[PDB]
């Protein structure tokens, strides 16, 4: 079976040679005449306290008003960013949650984690109570990230190197995506919903389409596990944060690594990655209790935003790009503008 | 004015709902912080189920001793890769590490796993209530003479029973030498990195022991005291 690895190496060398032939100039020397962002100071406008244990994930939704946050108590608390009012506090049968999602229309909320079960809840009830609308099983490993396509379909990345698309009323998987060697830890959907990427624990970000179960392309160039991923608002690029203290922006069309954001001063690993509305600002939440903002054109650290007593776990930016929500392990959600 | 009055009525209703939710969270505060959460780690043959038997994807059991509650987790539904979900168990107060003393092939990987747990960034401040399961099988194996410690640990020849060690009443010195060699092997890597903060709590237990819950309760009391002696400068 050595000869199969031999032509695998041959095609790898062909891919490397083709990538070398495709690229001649990097984005760094291309963008020199663009004026820099400038020093930006985002004060802590709101502080959304009340979670019993550490927070892992959050989501915003189409309206820039209602957060949802999952904590290790087993609580999904749905906040209100304008008035800091806890609209709902859904309890969980399993305290080990790891991710949460908020539907584009404010109807459904999702959670899951070490119980290997994706739970979907209705944010409407004629009886007036929040109930477990659906339980989704079929994943052997822990669920790392869930996202909503619409009110019907939900794509979930699990701990057994599988990303599965699920139909809510059917209750079973419709299309599985395999090919990763390590645990997938992040998931980001396209503005046109056609494509989505998954970054795994093998420095690999694989791009998939939600219709047929194929990997469009693979992106490599990191050194450790990928902890976060996020598309560009344009939909043709995406930035990945890893444990190697580097944020790497890749291009879908070029099938190549575009830009690196790192410094010799930084020592920890990136946990969360997000963009702004225009896409120039890359906000990355690190493990050194702070978050760093970067320009996506010149890799200059525009500012450092602090105020957390533990590692930053989740970062989110509203669909209109108004505010940035940060959630750390000290049970404190912070809104920044 | 009627529309403004209705808007204020809805705003006060939302504020009342928020206050009710906050009251429920404050009610759950004491109940959540009263309980102690423990995570079990070990091998497949380590027998990490005999620890609590009288009061008995994720295997959870609850036992209460002397008005102190204990959740006990045995996550084994995942794959063998541990570097990702082990960050979830950071708020636990202790880790019950169960090691089969009779087997020697898995003893080295148990040592490596314990070293990784001790030196982890997100498990740095977690104390380990380290157990030594299956003492009787170890005793029969070492009195049989078919298997030798020196085949897997060359430093057994240059080792003797510590004077601090208190042997069980009635046994040959060989079983004590072997079991305290394993205890010292775990404690050597337990007391090499962590400068205070977290400590190992070695114990010797068998399949017929009926008081392991008491050991866990006393050790968790000690861990709670040493944790309360951390934010305060007293130590």
């Amino acid at each position: 079976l050595d000869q199969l690895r031999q032509e695998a190496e041959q095609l790898k060398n062909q891919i490397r040679d083709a990538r070398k032939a495709c690229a001649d100039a990097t984005l760094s020397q291309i963008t020199n005449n663009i004026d820099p962002v400038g020093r930006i100071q985002m004060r802590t406008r709101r502080t959304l306290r009340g979670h019993l244990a550490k927070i892992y994930a959050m989501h915003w939704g189409t309206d820039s008003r209602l957060l949802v946050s999952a904590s290790q108590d087993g609580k999904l608390i749905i906040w209100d960013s304008y008035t800091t009012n806890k609209v709902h506090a859904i309890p969980l049968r399993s305290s080990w949650v790891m991710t949460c999602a908020y539907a584009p229309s404010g109807n459904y909320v999702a959670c899951g984690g070490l119980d290997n079960i994706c739970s979907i809840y209705n944010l409407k009830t004629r009886e007036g109570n929040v109930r477990v609308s659906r339980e989704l099983a079929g994943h052997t490993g822990y669920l790392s990230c869930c996202r909503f396509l619409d009110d019907n379909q939900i794509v979930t990345s699990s701990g057994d190197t599988t990303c599965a698309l699920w139909d809510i009323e059917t209750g079973q998987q419709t299309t599985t995506f395999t090919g990763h060697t390590g645990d997938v830890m992040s998931l980001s959907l396209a503005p046109d919903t056609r494509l989505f990427v998954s970054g795994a624990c093998d420095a690999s970000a694989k791009l998939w389409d939600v219709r047929e179960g194929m990997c469009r392309q693979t992106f490599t160039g990191h050194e450790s596990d990928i902890n976060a991923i996020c598309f560009f608002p344009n939909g043709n690029a995406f930035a990945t944060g890893s444990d190697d203290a580097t944020c790497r922006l890749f291009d879908l069309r070029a099938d190549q690594e575009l830009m690196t954001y790192s410094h010799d001063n930084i020592i920890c690993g990136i946990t969360s990655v997000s963009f702004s509305k225009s896409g120039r600002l890359l906000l990355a939440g690190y493990d050194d209790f702070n978050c760093n903002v970067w320009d996506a054109l010149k890799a200059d650290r525009a500012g450092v935003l602090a105020g957390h007593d533990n590692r930053v776990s989740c970062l989110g930016v509203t669909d209109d790009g108004m505010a940035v929500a940060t959630g750390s392990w000290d049970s404190f959600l912070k809104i920044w503008n | 004015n009627s529309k403004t009055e209705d808007k204020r009525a809805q705003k006060r209703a939302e504020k009342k709902r928020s206050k009710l939710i906050d009251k429920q969270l404050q009610d759950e505060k004491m109940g959540y912080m009263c309980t102690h959460r423990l995570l079990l780690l070990g091998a497949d043959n380590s027998g990490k189920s005999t620890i609590v038997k009288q009061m008995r994807g994720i295997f959870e059991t609850k036992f209460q001793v002397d008005k102190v509650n204990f959740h006990m987790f045995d996550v084994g539904g995942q794959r063998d890769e541990r570097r990702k979900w082990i960050q979830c168990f950071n708020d636990v107060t202790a880790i019950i590490f169960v090691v089969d003393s009779s087997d020697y092939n898995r003893l080295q990987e148990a040592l490596n796993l314990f070293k990784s747990i001790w030196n982890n960034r997100w498990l740095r401040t977690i104390s380990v209530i380290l157990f030594l399961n299956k003492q009787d099988l170890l005793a029969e194996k070492v009195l049989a003479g078919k298997s030798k410690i020196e085949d897997y640990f060359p430093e057994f020849a240059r080792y003797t029973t510590p004077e601090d060690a208190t042997p069980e009443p009635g046994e040959d010195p060989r079983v004590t030498r072997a079991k305290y060699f394993i205890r010292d092997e775990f404690l050597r890597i337990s007391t090499a990195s962590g400068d205070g903060r977290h400590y190992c709590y070695p114990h010797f237990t068998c399949a017929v022991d009926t008081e392991n819950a008491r050991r866990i309760f006393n050790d968790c009391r000690d861990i709670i005291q040493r944790m309360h002696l951390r934010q305060y400068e007293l130590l």
């Epitope: 190197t161 060697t181 390590g182 624990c201 190697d244 | 063998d80 541990r82 570097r83 070293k115 982890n120």
Partner: nanobody, 126 residues
Framework: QVQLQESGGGLVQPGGSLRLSCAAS????????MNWVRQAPGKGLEWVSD????????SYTGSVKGRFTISRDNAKNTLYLQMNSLKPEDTAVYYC?????????????????????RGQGTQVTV
């Protein structure tokens, strides 16, 4: 892209001396702890040796304590392991596994082939 190349080993009579070379491409080799892990026929994965970033702290499995030696070269980005006075149960497929973290002294490399940061290994037959 991360890659690890393993060279050396083969049909070696017992009692001989054998050197195994692991070359690292991709990452910065001068920053990562590195482990040597063997898989024997009919058994599972088991850890053999490790070496830190600067080589200050090393450790060996008791079955290979003393005879085995390990070294690394950060300028060449290549590490070496030498075995002397071999006993015939050492026949196995050997891998150099990278410790998947930037600045640590601990990680988790004994996994059932699902690990990523590990080369194809070399088969040593004795």
């Amino acid at each position: 892209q991360v890659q690890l190349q393993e060279s050396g080993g083969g049909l070696v009579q017992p009692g001989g001396s054998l050197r195994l070379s692991c070359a690292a491409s991709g990452f910065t080799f001068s920053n990562y702890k590195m482990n040597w892990v063997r898989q024997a026929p009919g058994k599972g994965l088991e850890w053999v040796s490790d070496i830190s970033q600067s080589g200050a702290s090393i450790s060996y499995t008791g079955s290979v304590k003393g005879r085995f030696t390990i070294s690394r070269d950060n300028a060449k980005n290549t590490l070496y392991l030498q075995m002397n006075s071999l006993k015939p149960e050492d026949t196995a497929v050997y891998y150099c596994a990278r410790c998947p973290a930037p600045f640590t002294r601990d990680c988790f490399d004994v996994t059932s082939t699902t690990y990523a940061y590990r080369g194809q290994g070399t088969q040593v037959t004795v």
